[PDB]
Amino acid sequence: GQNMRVAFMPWNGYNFEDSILVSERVVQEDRFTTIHIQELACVSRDTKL
C-alpha cells in the first residue's frame, strides 16, 4: 500500500461506524490508483442457414 499522515478524531458524523475519510490530496497524487485489464472476445460460426 502507501504511507499517509493519519489523525484521530470524530468528524461531522463521517466516521460514525468504522467509515474512513480521505482528502483530495490522496487522489491528486494518485497514490491509490490501480489499473485493470479485462478481456473481450467474439466467435464466428457457421449455422444451418
Partner 1 sequence: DIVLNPLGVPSRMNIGQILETHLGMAAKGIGDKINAMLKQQQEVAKLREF
Partner 2 sequence: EEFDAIKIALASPDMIRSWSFGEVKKPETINYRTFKPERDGLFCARIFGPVKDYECLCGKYKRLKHRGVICEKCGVEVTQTKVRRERMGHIELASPTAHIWFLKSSRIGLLLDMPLRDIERVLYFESYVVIEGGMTNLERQQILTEEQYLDALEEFGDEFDAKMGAEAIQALLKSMDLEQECEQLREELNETNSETKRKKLTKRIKLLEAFVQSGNKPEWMILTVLPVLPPDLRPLVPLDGGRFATSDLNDLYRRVINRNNRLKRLLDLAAPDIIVRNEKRMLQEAVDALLDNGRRGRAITGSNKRPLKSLADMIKGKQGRFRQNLLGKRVDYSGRSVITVGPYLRLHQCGLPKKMALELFKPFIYGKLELRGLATTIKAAKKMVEREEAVVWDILDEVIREHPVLLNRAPTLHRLGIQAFEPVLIEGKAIQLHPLVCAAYNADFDGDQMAVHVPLTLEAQLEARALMMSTNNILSPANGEPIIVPSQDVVLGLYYMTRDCVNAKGEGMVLTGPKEAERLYRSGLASLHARVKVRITEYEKDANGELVAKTSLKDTTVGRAILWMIVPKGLPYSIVNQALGKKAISKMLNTCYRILGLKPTVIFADQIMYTGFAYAARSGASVGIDDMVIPEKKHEIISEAEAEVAEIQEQFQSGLVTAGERYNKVIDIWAAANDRVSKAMMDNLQTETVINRDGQEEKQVSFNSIYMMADSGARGSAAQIRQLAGMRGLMAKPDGSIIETPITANFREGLNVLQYFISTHGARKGLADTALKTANSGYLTRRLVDVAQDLVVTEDDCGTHEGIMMTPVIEGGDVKEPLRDRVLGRVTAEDVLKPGTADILVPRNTLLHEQWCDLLEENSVDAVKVRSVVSCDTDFGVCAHCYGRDLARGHIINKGEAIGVIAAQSIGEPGTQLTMSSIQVKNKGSIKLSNVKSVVNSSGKLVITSRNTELKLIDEFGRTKESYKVPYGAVLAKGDGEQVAGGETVANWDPHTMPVITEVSGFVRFTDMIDGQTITRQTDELTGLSSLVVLDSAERTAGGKDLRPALKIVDAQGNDVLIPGTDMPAQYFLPGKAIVQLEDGVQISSGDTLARIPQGLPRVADLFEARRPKEPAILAEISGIVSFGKETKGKRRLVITPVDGSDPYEEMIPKWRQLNVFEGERVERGDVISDGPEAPHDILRLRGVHAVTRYIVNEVQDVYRLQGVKINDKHIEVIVRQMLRKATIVNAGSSDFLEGEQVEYSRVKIANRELEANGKVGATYSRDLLGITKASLATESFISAASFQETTRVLTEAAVAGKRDELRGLKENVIVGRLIPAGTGYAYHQDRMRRRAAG
Binding residues for partner 1 (CB under 8 A): 3-11, 14-23, 25-26
Contact yes or no for 36/6 (Cβ under 8 A): no
To which residue does cell 493519519 refer?
Answer: 6
CB under 5 to 8 A by kind: which of partner 2, partner 1, none does 42 bind?
none
Instruction: Provide, rounded to whole angstroms, the least separation between the CB of residue 4 and partner 1.
Output: 4
Question: Distance from CA of residue 20 to its chain's centroid?
Answer: 14
Range 1-49, binding partner 2 (CB under 8 A): 8-19, 45, 48
Using CB under 8 A as the criterion, which residues of the chain lie in contact with partner 2 when the complex forms?
8-19, 45, 48
